[PDB]
């Protein structure tokens, strides 16, 4: 029944500041407060807990996985416990947060952007039905993410990491939807051209800065660094853009592009036409260092997708008589 | 403190000696204005203005020439202080009062409408000599964000029609002098802001009152004012312009300079030179296309066609145009230029393929803006539906196996013959290549694009799609439409 509902959606305590001050073992206290409340107040407590979780996510991530990720998971579970019983208040809070994020993006380009926006988007995707096509919270969040991906520029490793995190969040939100996104392909092309700017083949891509690059100095072996998702830690340490860090970011971007190609763009033959230059850019990667393994696999997958597709035609527009 | 006491003593007043002392105090204030720039100054300026008004109301070689000399010295001091918020407004008010006194009292014979030319030229030279770091080289928008010049242009130049003609005559007379012409060419943002204020005397939709009580033939000849404006525009567009300044000048030429120009041959030549301008800078590459819209104004003015206008329009469409805020004007120009009945099917197919690629690499707003153009092209051109549907690859249940085998053999050797690198729209084989990229944009996150694709996939009911309502669309507009 839940799967059918998802498919159908696809086809069609008081103050927050006072609660944050009281919290500043916060998860246990929040759970105790929620239990005492459940023994409008529940919705206010849920909104205060969401605000405290957003403040903890966008403030610092200095604690380790077992010290910060466990508390974040406990807070997410406490928020999701009251999310099934309260959905209109949660939708109103999500709409207010989206409006605040839009106002911050309109006021400042990158100064008003925080690291808790990705965590808030992930929490909104996990809590609300991500399979829903027309939703009061999911659709506006996806539109805001597409606007941020198509409007912001890349000039440092922080912008590249934020774009990679946004692309991963869009792929996770469209993991069940499997919708084609030209903004995601444009962001992937811009990330490929920015890391290969160090050029003449792609001149209409309109790269933001040519200072970013990726020299052939990283081995990119099996001992290389993983994705290691920590938005605050990666954004606060992106001023010193290392060769290992940039190589890990490029490998994560290539893996995300391959996952989107084999999971979302594999169902469109015209996307193979949209994969005409980008795989060529991957071929440029094959002409860049000639030692990476992800680019050869991406080229092989693109060749297999082109060979499997017939690239014929598809039309309709028919009619007949009547009763 | 002492300034207020001096003002009171001058107002209470042996009054000639007091007036001379007040003038000397004003001169001392204007001399110390440098150190001031490094509440008393405004009071001193007000006192000087009051003294000048009293001298104009009273006096008219030591009784008439002395007062005039003192007034001239005070005016020169004020001009030097203005050249080298409250102080600027006080200086502007004092200059307006001095101009009124010169037009009302300095005339030799009463009855003849005469306006001063030396004082106006001195005021224009003092205003043009002032240059600020934040005024020139505007990066966000505009050309010159001044504090005294913009206020004077919006409060005095935008309220009188004879003042605009007098300023044009003063600029034309100053264009003969080399130093004044060099000063006017160095400060080109002030002239650009005056042109973008859109308060000229040639505009018939707006009327300006007479500043002086007697107009000195302000509407004698609008052709002379138009010729002076054209000469000023030709002299101010010779050089020393940035890329953003060039874009603003092209926008002004296509918006509110062609209507105020007497001879459009020079404007058309400048628009044709700017439309062919291309460099390695990514910002200037879209600077010419909007100027080509000004060439369209030439297409609405003279019977002169540009060389390879269709090829230039085909090569001017790129992903940088769709990512720019001036994409609506370019899309409107492309829709208007494609309304001719002499367009061929190969060029139309190449334009459709270029628009499909542009929608494949853009945000949702550009795709929503370009969907109506594709719908209008499909409604106007019935052969474009051949690019939408292929009857040779269709299969029927009441058919022979030989036809199905022939269709399968034809589809097994199916290739894409369109060339994206081909600049000629006629040479591009986008007619033989299907418009597959339209199917890739059908599955979109936005619901408006999905609704537009569903409407385009079905049969066309009405020919008028009303593309004007869906023309201005952005991310903020879509978010406001979805949230409200």
Swiss-Prot record, chain A:
Top-level taxon in the UniProt lineage: Eukaryota
Localisation: Nucleus, Nucleolus
Reported function: Involved in nucleolar processing of pre-18S ribosomal RNA. Has a role in the nuclear export of 40S pre-ribosomal subunit to the cytoplasm.
Similarity comment: family membership: Belongs to the NOP14 family.
Oligomer and partners: Interacts with snoRNA U3. Interacts with EMG1, MPP10 and NOC4. Component of the ribosomal small subunit (SSU) processome composed of at least 40 protein subunits and snoRNA U3.
Protein name listed in UniProt: Nucleolar complex protein 14
Native source organism of the sequence: Saccharomyces cerevisiae (strain ATCC 204508 / S288c) (Baker's yeast)
Upper lineage: Eukaryota, Fungi, Dikarya, Ascomycota, Saccharomycotina
Designated gene of the protein: NOP14
